[PDB]
């Protein structure tokens, strides 16, 4: 009547991620009601959608880019690599969230908030260039890829979504080494028309830059990034 068992070779091992529970030692303990509580979330995707600041001019990072009164088709206002590893994104919640997973999929959202004067006017060309032929070198080449024209007026910001264009269903989150001329392409910001203004107004303005996940965005396989010290 005692039951016969066969002991597996792995007898005694401890698995840090075992899909199971252990021995309870202090049962029947009621907790302190926490039912008045608010603000709970349950999925990181629930908040990955909130835009945080992209760092410009690293390592002297500022949360914005500057538009000028000159449109050089040869000069991007910004060039971001589309990699959740860009030093550019290093401190966005998107990047901080993403660094705990192995792969991502879906839309990335670059939000621009114009902060100049109400009296200023201007147009920007924001483009996404998939990899393969290198980064575009003039607005004329960028304009050949996915892009949008942002006109300044009553409405303050512009939300640009870079479409997930990829051979694989998912893309690796982080880079092992550095990713070349690769990565997954580039977001470049250009002036189409120069910032124009009347007399009595500054001749340049700051554009706030943020990033977030699109409704499309997914992350999978939780891991740990290489440990670091903020200092």
């Amino acid at each position: 009547s005692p039951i016969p068992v066969t002991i597996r070779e792995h007898a005694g091992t401890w698995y840090s991620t075992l899909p199971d529970s252990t021995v309870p030692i202090y049962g029947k303990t009621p907790v302190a009601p926490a039912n008045y509580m608010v603000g709970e979330y349950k999925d990181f995707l629930e908040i990955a959608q909130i835009p945080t600041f992209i760092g410009n001019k690293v390592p002297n990072a500022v949360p914005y880019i500057e538009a000028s009164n000159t449109a050089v088709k040869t000069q991007p206002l910004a060039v971001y690599q589309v990699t959740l590893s860009c030093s550019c994104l290093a401190n966005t919640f998107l990047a901080a969230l993403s660094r705990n997973f192995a792969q991502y999929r879906g839309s990335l959202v670059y939000t621009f908030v114009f902060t100049g004067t109400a009296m200023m006017k201007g147009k920007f060309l924001i483009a996404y260039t998939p990899p393969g032929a290198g980064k575009p070198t003039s607005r004329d080449q960028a304009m050949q890829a996915t892009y949008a024209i942002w006109d300044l007026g009553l409405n303050s910001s512009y939300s640009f979504t870079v479409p997930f264009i990829s051979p694989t269903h998912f893309r690796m989150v982080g880079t092992d080494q550095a990713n070349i001329t690769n990565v997954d392409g580039w977001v470049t910001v250009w002036q189409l028309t120069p910032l124009t203004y009347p007399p009595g107004c500054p001749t340049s303005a700051k554009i706030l830059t943020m990033v977030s996940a699109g409704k499309d965005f997914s992350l999978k396989m939780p891991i740990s990034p290489a440990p670091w010290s903020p200092q």
Binding site: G12, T22, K42, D43, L45, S87, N100, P225
Partner: protein, 268 residues
């Protein structure tokens, strides 16, 4: 899509809003909070004092490898009183304390991963603990677990020849035999008198005297663990696992240094 971020809320899109595209959603469940923290991570190495199995307990540390541990993911220890009962701290101490020193490995005890990534103000959960002796030979370990806010000075030996850890009706765990697997595992309930626990910081004092020292809310841990054992030379790792985690109010995470290098990072 034109938008107005000043409202404090921004409409979410997919490539579909401005271009000729299609949504590309695919389901996954590894981003749920509970699933994410429901895995073990280490908080440090500990030690047992010689002959603690049969005498009065006393705070002590081996190489900044102490005797007792507070169950909390936050920093604790303070290498300067490695011989005093440990305490919760409001900062992490580097490996050395002068220029020429090093940050890793850290001296204090904490769940560095939790610290590095906890985008919430408050949380609630049960704690699963794993004790792992750094030896594959026999190892005897006596553990005393005291709920938060209860007596934590297991100093008086009441029974002749019996560890003072091994006294009372307070939960005690003991593994020691030639056929054990040496490790110990168990899960403790949530005992803070608080409804929910501060995850990073608590902006208030300890007394109404405002004898000003903000940071930690009192009795906001899972209790203290005291160790006694037979291999005073083997150290053991302690790991925490958050069972049924719940978090409230998103907040920022730890700063990541600007690559004064490339336009991307890596690893290490």
């Amino acid at each position: 899509g034109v938008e107005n971020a000043e409202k404090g809320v921004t409409e979410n899109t997919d490539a579909t809003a401005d271009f000729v595209a299609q949504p590309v959603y695919l389901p996954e469940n590894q981003t749920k909070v509970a699933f994410f923290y429901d895995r073990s991570s280490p908080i440090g190495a500990f030690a047992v004092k010689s002959g603690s199995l049969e005498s009065g307990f006393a705070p002590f540390s081996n190489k900044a490898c102490p005797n007792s541990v507070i169950l909390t993911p936050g920093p604790q220890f303070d290498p300067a009183y490695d011989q005093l009962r440990p305490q919760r701290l409001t900062e992490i101490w580097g490996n050395g304390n002068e220029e020429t020193s090093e940050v890793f490995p850290l001296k204090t005890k904490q769940d560095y991963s939790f610290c590095l990534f906890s985008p919430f103000v408050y949380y609630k959960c049960d704690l699963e603990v794993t004790l792992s002796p750094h030896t594959s030979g026999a190892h005897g370990l006596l553990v005393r677990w005291c709920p938060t806010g209860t007596p934590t000075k297991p100093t008086t030996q009441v029974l002749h020849e019996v560890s003072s850890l091994s006294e009372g009706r307070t939960p005690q765990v003991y593994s020691a035999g030639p056929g054990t697997s040496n490790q110990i595992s168990f899960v403790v309930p949530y005992n803070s008198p608080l409804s929910v626990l501060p995850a990073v910081w608590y902006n208030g004092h300890k007394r109404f005297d405002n004898t000003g020292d903000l940071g930690i809310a009192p009795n906001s841990d899972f209790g203290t663990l005291f160790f006694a054992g037979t291999k005073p030379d083997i150290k053991f790792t302690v790991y925490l696992r958050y069972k049924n985690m719940r978090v409230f109010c998103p907040r920022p995470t730890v700063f990541f240094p600007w690559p004064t290098s490339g336009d991307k990072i890596d690893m290490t």
